[PDB]
Design a protein around this ligand. Sequence first.
Ligand SMILES: CCC1=C[C@@H]2Cc3nc4cc(Cl)ccc4c(N)c3[C@H](C1)C2
Ligand SMILES: CCC1=C[C@@H]2Cc3nc4cc(Cl)ccc4c(N)c3[C@H](C1)C2
Ligand SMILES: *[C@@H]1O[C@H](CO)[C@@H](O)[C@H](O)[C@H]1NC(C)=O
Ligand SMILES: *[C@@H]1O[C@H](CO)[C@@H](O)[C@H](O)[C@H]1NC(C)=O
Ligand SMILES: *[C@@H]1O[C@H](CO)[C@@H](O)[C@H](O)[C@H]1NC(C)=O
Ligand SMILES: *[C@@H]1O[C@H](CO)[C@@H](O)[C@H](O)[C@H]1NC(C)=O
Lengths: 532, 532
Amino acid sequence: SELLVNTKSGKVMGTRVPVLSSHISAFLGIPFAEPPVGNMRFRRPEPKKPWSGVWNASTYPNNCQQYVDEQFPGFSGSEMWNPNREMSEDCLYLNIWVPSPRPKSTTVMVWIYGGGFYSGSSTLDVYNGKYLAYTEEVVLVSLSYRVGAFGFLALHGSQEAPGNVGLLDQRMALQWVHDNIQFFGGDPKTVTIFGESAGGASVGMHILSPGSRDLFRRAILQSGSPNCPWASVSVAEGRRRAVELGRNLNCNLNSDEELIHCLREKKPQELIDVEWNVLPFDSIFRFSFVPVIDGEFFPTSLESMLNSGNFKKTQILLGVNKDEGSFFLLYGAPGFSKDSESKISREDFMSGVKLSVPHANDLGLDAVTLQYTDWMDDNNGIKNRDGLDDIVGDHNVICPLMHFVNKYTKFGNGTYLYFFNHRASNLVWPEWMGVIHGYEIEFVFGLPLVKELNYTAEEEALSRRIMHYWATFAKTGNPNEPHSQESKWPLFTTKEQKFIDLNTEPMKVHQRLRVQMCVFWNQFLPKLLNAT
Amino acid sequence: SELLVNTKSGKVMGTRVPVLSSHISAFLGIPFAEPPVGNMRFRRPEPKKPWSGVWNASTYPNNCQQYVDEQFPGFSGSEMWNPNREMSEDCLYLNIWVPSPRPKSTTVMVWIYGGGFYSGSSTLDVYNGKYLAYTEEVVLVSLSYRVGAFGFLALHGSQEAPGNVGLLDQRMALQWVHDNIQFFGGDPKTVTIFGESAGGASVGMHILSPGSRDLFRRAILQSGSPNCPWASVSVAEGRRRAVELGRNLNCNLNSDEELIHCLREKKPQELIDVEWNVLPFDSIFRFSFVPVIDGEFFPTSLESMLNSGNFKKTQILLGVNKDEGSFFLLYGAPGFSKDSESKISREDFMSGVKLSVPHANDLGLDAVTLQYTDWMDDNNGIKNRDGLDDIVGDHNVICPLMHFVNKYTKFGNGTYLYFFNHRASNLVWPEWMGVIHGYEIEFVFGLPLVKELNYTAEEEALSRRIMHYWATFAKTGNPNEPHSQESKWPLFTTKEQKFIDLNTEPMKVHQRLRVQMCVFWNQFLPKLLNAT
Ligand SMILES: CCC1=C[C@@H]2Cc3nc4cc(Cl)ccc4c(N)c3[C@H](C1)C2
Ligand SMILES: CCC1=C[C@@H]2Cc3nc4cc(Cl)ccc4c(N)c3[C@H](C1)C2
Ligand SMILES: *[C@@H]1O[C@H](CO)[C@@H](O)[C@H](O)[C@H]1NC(C)=O
Ligand SMILES: *[C@@H]1O[C@H](CO)[C@@H](O)[C@H](O)[C@H]1NC(C)=O
Ligand SMILES: *[C@@H]1O[C@H](CO)[C@@H](O)[C@H](O)[C@H]1NC(C)=O
Ligand SMILES: *[C@@H]1O[C@H](CO)[C@@H](O)[C@H](O)[C@H]1NC(C)=O
C-alpha cells in the first residue's frame, strides 16, 4: 500500500488527501522524540522508542504549550496563527506530504515554523504542505519544537534545564529525516531546511552549530537571521530570567535544583501566564525564552563564528518583507490601532523609538531619531508612523540579515537574496501595515492557487514563481532553471550585492539592500553605544 | 567747498570722483585713532589727537600688517584680496563716500571687512563704496582694524596685550562715525553696520557687547556669525597661543611682561612668518589670533548671552552663499586643485573630514562621515568632493548662522534671511568651487554696473536689486518698499522660518534653510562630543 511505510522506528499509515483536483499522501503526526513530560520538562529530548504495530498517521498532532493571541477575538488575521489543535507538552511530532505515486529519491524540504521562539504550530492552514509537495514534486516535511520556557528556559551549568532544548528538538527531527526519509521516497542527501522569523533564525543556527551541519544540504531563511537582537541571550541573562520566572511563581530560589523542581510542578498555563514578566526592558520585538550562547550548541559568540568562517559552507536563499515592523507596533506601541490609519504624533514617535531600541542610552535614542526624522516636515503623522515601521524592521530583521548575508557570502558557495514587497489583495489587516511580517509565507506554500481563497490571477502566478524558485533551489542550489528563457535571479556577490524584488511586476534587479540604514544599525550605532 | 568738512577732530579735504558717468565726493584715509605703534602694539586703541590745518583725504591709507596670499602668483582670483597699498602698523583709518550735492541727514552704512581676523583691507576694488553711495544715496563708510597678532594676541589679565583690541578698533571708528558723520551729511541715528566673514562675525559681536550696542541702529551679516567655531577662543587657549608665538621667536617666557616686551621688539614680518605655527590642530578654517571670551567685551559665554536675550534688540538682515567651503578645501585639503575638477577619492575624503572637524574624536568623525556619505555610490568622486564642500560650509558658516538667527529672532524686532546662489558668469575660479565664500560682495557693492567688468545684463539687474534691498533695509528696517509691486522678501519668523534665494531667477521663498544638516551640527554632534 502507498499509505504504509516501514521506518526504522516502526510502521506508519498515512492518508490520501485531495489537492488541486488531484491527490497525494500525507503522514501526519509521526513521533520523533519521547514525550518531553514530567521530570523531562526542560531536558534535552530523547529519541522516540521504536513501536510495534502500525502508527496511525492520518491526523494532525497536538501543538506545543504556548501563549495564545487574544488581542482581536474572532479576527482571522490574528487567529490564523493560534494553535488550531489541542495544546499539550506531548507535542514532538512531524508531518510529511508525499507525491503520488511515491517517489524513489526526490528532493526534500523541511519547514521550521516561526513565532519569536514563544509560539508556533506545524498545523496551521498557511503551513499546509500539500500544494508545494504536489506542485513541485518534493517530499515536504514540517517538524515541531518546544517554545517558551518549555523549550528555552536556561540555567547554564545544570543538566536538567541547560537551555536550547527547543533547538535540539529541531535537530532530532532533522536526524529522523536523515535516517528515515528514504522510505518515503525522499533523498536524505538533498534536504533543504527553510523557516520564517525564529524559524529563519533557527535555520541559520543549524548552519552555525557543528552538531547540526551534517544533517542537511542547503538552507532558506525568511525574515530572520541567527544574529538578530531578539534571537539569543547570554547565559547570564538566561539565568537571570529563569530565576525571575521562579520568583513570579513563588518558587524556592536557593538552588538550580530547587528552582527547577518547583517549575516542574507547575501546570503549563502557570508558566505561560507570567512569561512576559521577565523581560529586562519596556520593549517591543523582545521575547523571554530564546536560544543561549552556551559554548556547546554555539562554540563561541555568533559574530566571531561568522568572522572566522566557522559554519556550514553551502548555498543559501534568503530575504525580507517591505514592512517587517508594522505587526509589532500595532501590538505594543502607543498610537497604533487596527481600525485607524494610525498617524503618529511626535510624542508617540518618541515613545516608539524608546520601545524599539530598549538597550539604548539617550545619545543612542537621539541618533536613531535623527536618522529617521525628516526635519523639514517633522509633524507629518504618516512619516512618523512609517519612520517607526522602518526603524523596527531595519533594526530587528533587515539589517541583521544583511550583516549575516555579507559575512556568509565570503565563505559560502552561493547566495540568492530577495525583497518581498507585494501586498495581498485579500489582506484583512489595515493598509498602513503594508507587507507584514509573516505574509510572504502564504505565497511560499501556494495558497493563492486555491480559488476559494480569493487571490487574483497575478497573485497565483507570483505564488507559482516563488514555489518554483524555492523548489528548484532545494533541488540544485540555484533557483533559476539554467536553459530557461525567463528573467534570471542573479547571484548575490560580495562585490555587486545584487538582489531582486518579489511581486507581481516584471522582475527587477537592485543593489545594496537598505545599505544607508544598515551601515547605521550595523556599524555606527553599535560603536556609539560601546563608546558611551 | 563741497570737499571741505570741519569735524570735531579737525578739517578734512576730500576729492571728487567719477562714478557711472557722474560724480560724488570721497574722503579717504581719515585717522580715527592714534597710530598703534611701538609700545602701543597690542594695546587698546587711543582716540586720535585733534589736528590743526587741513587733513588731505584724497588718497587711500596704508593697509594693516598681514599674511599675504602667494598661493597663485599673478592670479587675479586670489590677488584681488591682497593688500593693494603699502602695509604698515600705522593703519587705523576710515573712508567716506558722499553723494553730490552733500546730503543733510541721510542713511549711513558702515562696512567691516572680513578675512578670518588674520587679513583684510578697506581699500580693495571690490569694497569701492562709490557705486552704492551714488546709486542708493547713502553715506558709505568703510573702517579698518588690526588683524593677526597685532589685533588679537591675548594674555588675559595683562593690560598691555588684553586681547580683542581689533574689535575695539572697530568700536572707535563707530564712535567717530557717531560723533562726526553729521558734518558729512549723514544721520548718526540711522547707521547700519554690515560686513562679510569675520566682518559679519564682528557685526554680531557688536550686537552682543554692551559697550558697542548704542553706537549703531541696525545690522547686516554676510557669511559669518559671532558664534562661529573659528571666530573666538577661550582666554586659556588665547594665552597658550601667545606663549607658543613667543616660543617660535625665541622669547623669554618667564612673565607676560617679558613675553610682550620681546614681541614688541620684533618686526611685523617676523610675527607674520610664524603666525600659523600656533594652531592646536591640523585643520582648515581655523585662524591663530581671534577674539577672546574675556568677561569684558563679552560679559559671559556667547551661548548664554544668546539664550538670555542679552544683546541689542533691533532688525537684522543676514545670509550665506551656496558653497562656502570650496575656498578652504582648495587651499588646504589633499586632492583639491585649482586646475582640475578635483574629484575626490575615498581616502582624501576621509583626510578632509579630519581636517574639517579638528576637534572631533573618532566616533564624531564617523558620525560626520555617515551623515554626508551616500552609501549606494560611495566611490563617486564628485559626490565626495561636493560632500566635503558642504561639510566645511555647514559646520563653519551656515549652521552657526542658523543657530544665531533662531536665537536672535526670539527677542529681535525683525529678521530677513537670504541664500545667495548665483555663480558669476565672469568667475576666474574653476566650476567645482561653485558660489564661493566672499563672492556675493561684488554684487553688494555694485561692480556688475560697470560695463568693462563684463557681467551680464541679468547680473547688473541682480546687483541693483541687492543694493536696493540692503540700502532700503538700512534706511527703514525692512528691505522691501511697502507700496511697491515687486515680489516681497518675507520676514523670518520663529514659526515659519522663511527665507529667499538671491540669484537671476524670479524670487522664490523657502523654509528651514539646511535644517537636516544643522540639527546634526547644532544639536546632535555637540551632544555626542560631550558625552564621549
Ligand atoms: C514574532 C512572532 C510571530 C512571528 C510569525 C509571523 C506572525 N505574523 C503576525 C502578523 C500579525 Cl499582523 C498578527 C499576528 C502574527 C503572528 N501571530 C505571527 C506568528 C508569530 C509567526
Ligand atoms: C577667511 C579668510 C578671508 C575671507 C573673505 C573672503 C575671501 N574669499 C577668497 C576666496 C578664494 Cl577662492 C581665494 C581667496 C579669498 C580671500 N582672500 C578672501 C578674503 C579672506 C575675505
Ligand atoms: C486513526 O486511524 C484509524 C484507522 O486505524 C481511523 O479510522 C481513525 O479515523 C484515525 N483517527 C482517529 C479517528 O483518531
Ligand atoms: C561552489 O563550489 C564549486 C566546487 O567546489 C565551485 O566550482 C563553484 O565555483 C562554487 N560556486 C560558488 C558560487 O562559489
Ligand atoms: C594730498 O593733497 C594735495 C593737496 O594739498 C594733493 O596735491 C596731493 O596729490 C594729495 N596726495 C598726495 C600727492 O600724496
Ligand atoms: C518692532 O517693535 C515695534 C514697536 O516696539 C512693534 O510695534 C513691532 O511689532 C515690532 N516688529 C517686530 C517684527 O517685532
